Each structure stands twice: as structure tokens, then as C-alpha cells.
Amino acid sequence: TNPYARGPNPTAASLEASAGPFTVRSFTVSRPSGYGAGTVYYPTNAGGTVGAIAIVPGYTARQSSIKWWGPRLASHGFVVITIDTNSTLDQPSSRSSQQMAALRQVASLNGTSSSPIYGKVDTARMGVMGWSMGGGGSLISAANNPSLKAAAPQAPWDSSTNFSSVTVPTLIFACENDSIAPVNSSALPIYDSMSRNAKQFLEINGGSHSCANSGNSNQALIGKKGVAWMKRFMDNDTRYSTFACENPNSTRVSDFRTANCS
């Protein structure tokens, strides 16, 4: 009997819909600490404490690029903070520092009786996600913070592609026709480098660099996979082992790989 298991037994239909079972509320972080701005999404009556996910956009980009993840994840039983960085020109290591700052603030707000997320977060169970340089930032966060329970960056880029130290279960969303952070020189070498973890590579067929962003046309598949990965690894929830680890066998996917996916 897994104490972190929340919500109804998952179905494809329920994981593919635009929102899951829980009602989602949100607020703006009034005094953001160590980053630009943040929006916190959270479920009402998830049936216990839930893990937290900090999501960072890429270079020149804002919360809007990665907004859709907030309600999508939160509606399956997660507290999600989407951030703006101190500057939109921040680099990946700075993105990562700011991501971890956002998580610490979430942990702090869990114990502030005035916060709507008071007593709602299990602050020992956290994950990281993000687009482009924010994707590299998530991988950096993971490498520097092995206590994190999961990472799921999208169209990631960093100077280095060597993330061989990462022990955090890591799902890489890739975009097949990415001409900004091309798969062959960023997402794929990143993926291949990680020898110490459960991991997955999911390339979206014909996707541009923004193929996992708000307003994308594979929200059913991408949302299912992100929630399934976070469920399986953040909650240790083996109801999601198949959703998390399976090949989707979808014409929407041009390349699928996975390793150590129990």
C-alpha cells in the first residue's frame, strides 16, 4: 500500500484528456525569492500531500511557453510552479539555480499558514521540467540535486551534452525537426550520455523547437507521458509503470527509446 498514490486508477482516456480528475487553482507568488516571477498551480483535495514540480522556459521566453503543464500536471495531483527567470537571457546554470530557488520557495510556502498550498506539499518529493535552455537547466538541476525524484525537460540544450552523472529518472521530450537545438547535437547525445538512470527519449514527428509548448498539437500524448513519468517516479506509483515505460506506437512519434524502465 503505497502512501504516495493519489487519485483514480489511470486510463489512456483520462491521461489523454486536457485535464485530469482534480480541480486546479492557482496564485501568483507575491515576493518571488531567487527568480523573476512564479505561478503556483495546485489540486484541491488530492487525498494527501503531493510532490512539487518547477518548470522553467528557455532563452527569450516566458511562463506562457510552458504554462499548459501547470494545470495539466496539477489536475493529476502535483503542486506546479511555472517561473519567469530574473532575465530572459539567463543561461542554463542560472536557470537551474532559479529552478531550485522556486522549489525552495514552494517548500517554504508549504509551511506558511497564509499560503493556499499550506500543508499540501510533500517537500521531499520534487521534480524538474523545462524548455530549451530551461531543459538544460532541469538536467543541471538533476545532476546537482540527486534527491530530486524526476526530470522531464523538453527540446533541451546546454553547452555540454554530457549528463552521465544523472541518477534522476529522466524523460527527454525531443522535437524531430528542431533547428534551434537539433536533436542529433543536443537531445539525443544528452539522452545517450545518461548511463546511471531510468530514462526515456520521445521524439515528436515533424516537431519544431516548440513542439512541447503551450498550444502544441500533441497535448494528449505529451501530457499523458509527462504525467505518467511524474506519477511513476515522483509517487513510486506502479499503476503508471506501463504508461510511463511503454512505446506509444504512435505515428506522432518518430523515435522512441527507453532504458531501466521499471
Q: CATH number for the domain including 47?
A: 3.40.50.1820
Q: What would you report as the CA-atom Rg of the chain, rounded to the nearest whole angstrom?
A: 16
Total structural domains within the chain: 1
Each residue of 190-208: b (16+ CB within 10 Å) or e? bbbbbeebbbbbbbbeebe
Q: Is 157 a known ligand-binding residue? A: yes
- Residues with catalytic annotation? 132, 178, 209
What distance in Å separates the CA atoms of residue 65 and residue 101, rounded to the nearest whole number?
A: 20
DSSP string, 210-226: TTTSTT-TTHHHHHHHH
59 is in an annotated binding site: yes
Residue 53 C-alpha cell reads as: 514540480
Q: State how far the Cα of 197 lies from the Cα of 7, in Å rounded to an integer.
A: 27
In angstroms, rounded to a whole number, what is the distance separating the alpha carbons of residues 11 and 15? Answer: 6
Resolution of the PDB structure in angstroms: 2.0
Short-list 161, 51, 173, 176, CA closest to 106: 51
- CA 245 to chain CA centroid, nearest Å: 16
Residue 233 Cα distances to 36, 197, 229, angstroms: 28, 11, 6
The Cβ of residue 7 has, within 10 Å, a number of other Cβ atoms equal to: 20
Could you list the residue range(s) of the whole structural domain that residue 77 is in?
A: 1-262
- Residue the block writes with cell 488530492: 46
